[PDB]
Nucleic acid binder design. Structure first.
Length: 95
DNA sequence: CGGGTTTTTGTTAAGGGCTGTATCACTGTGTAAGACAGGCCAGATC
């Protein structure tokens, strides 16, 4: 009995979308170079802007570009150094 | 109360990559004065 897509587990969702996975990967590496993740997030942003949710698309662009809700290692290194944090104290703080 | 049928859930093997944890040899905080026995000279003395 079918219930819903996101109600399944990871392996079950993979079993259910293996066909679309193969199709998208082949039709993306035929002509579009082969970057599967690129075509994936591009199609997702397009389907999301179809619902004109500018906010969600901007947040996803920020996440996938590293500029919000998550720091690149250089910035947190500068924070760990310029604030005189130790390696164990930063660890506790990060733990 | 089971077949027929369907959607979830493991299961093996080998390799890759990110995350967490044990291990090594060490540290910094326990830090100033007083009690007492022995020697010794200045001096009252009988």
């Amino acid at each position: 009995p079918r219930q819903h897509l996101l109600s399944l587990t990871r392996r079950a969702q993979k079993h259910r979308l293996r066909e679309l996975k193969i199709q998208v990967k082949e039709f993306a590496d035929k002509e579009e170079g082969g970057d599967v993740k690129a075509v994936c997030l591009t199609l997702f942003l397009l389907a999301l802007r179809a619902r004109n949710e500018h906010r969600q698309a901007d947040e996803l662009e920020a996440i996938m570009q590293g500029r919000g809700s998550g720091l690149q290692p250089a910035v947190c290194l500068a924070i760990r150094v310029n604030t005189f944090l130790s390696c164990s104290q930063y660890h506790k703080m990060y733990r």
